[PDB]
Write a protein that binds this ligand. Structure first.
Ligand SMILES: CC[C@H](C)CN(C[C@@H](O)[C@H](Cc1ccccc1)NC(=O)O[C@H]1CO[C@H]2OCC[C@H]21)S(=O)(=O)c1ccc(N)cc1
Lengths: 99, 99
């Protein structure tokens, strides 16, 4: 679909058999989700945003469906202010900026 | 034009008679630019993201040209690690997300 930016581009995602709302974030290299339980192994990592760095758990090769489009990639889980879908997954669903 | 998200969507902007590289960021509510000496009055503000909040100066009705598309609106200035074009100006240049 075509999404205008008058409001936050929030969309429903499905990860680990659970529905959630997430922000399509072209300014994020990576996908960061709020605290949740995900199966499989994970590795501790650090990510930095506008206000500093936070500790996150990195989950690789995770299936996640964004607005009816499937993707399999890395998902970081930690104390982010909001679920954000970053470019690592936006590319998988064929998302582009157009003006 | 169309911009893919394989790499950061950086573009050239023109503000206060200066050319800069800025990020087209659908996840950013409002434009925030790296520290620069803009004239005129301003109002303090704090914006939050990954890692916490930063203090910025809010300038109103600032003219910015993004990829030859003129815009005018709020521009925040503060210790951001990167110039960010937010939704408040992306709408003005007709920018949409598409997949
Ligand atoms: C609350 C939603 C989202 C986190 C908000 N951010 C925009 C976001 O695009 C930032 C914009 C951003 C990009 C680069 C450095 C600092 C901020 N990206 C980001 O934090 O991504 C992180 C996750 O992937 C990694 O790639 C980029 C940093 C990591 S932000 O920078 O903090 C921001 C908040 C309010 C305004 N008005 C303008 C910008």
């Amino acid at each position: 679909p075509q999404i205008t930016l008058w409001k936050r581009p929030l969309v429903t995602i499905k990860i680990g058999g659970q529905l959630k709302e997430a922000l399509l974030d072209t300014g994020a290299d990576d996908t960061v989700l709020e605290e949740m339980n995900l199966p499989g192994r994970w590795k501790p990592k650090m990510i930095g945003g506008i206000g500093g760095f936070i500790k996150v758990r990195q989950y690789d090769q995770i299936l996640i469906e964004i607005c009816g489009h499937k993707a399999i990639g890395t998902v970081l889980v930690g104390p982010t202010p909001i679920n954000i879908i970053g470019r690592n997954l936006l590319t998988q669903i064929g998302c582009t900026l157009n003006f």
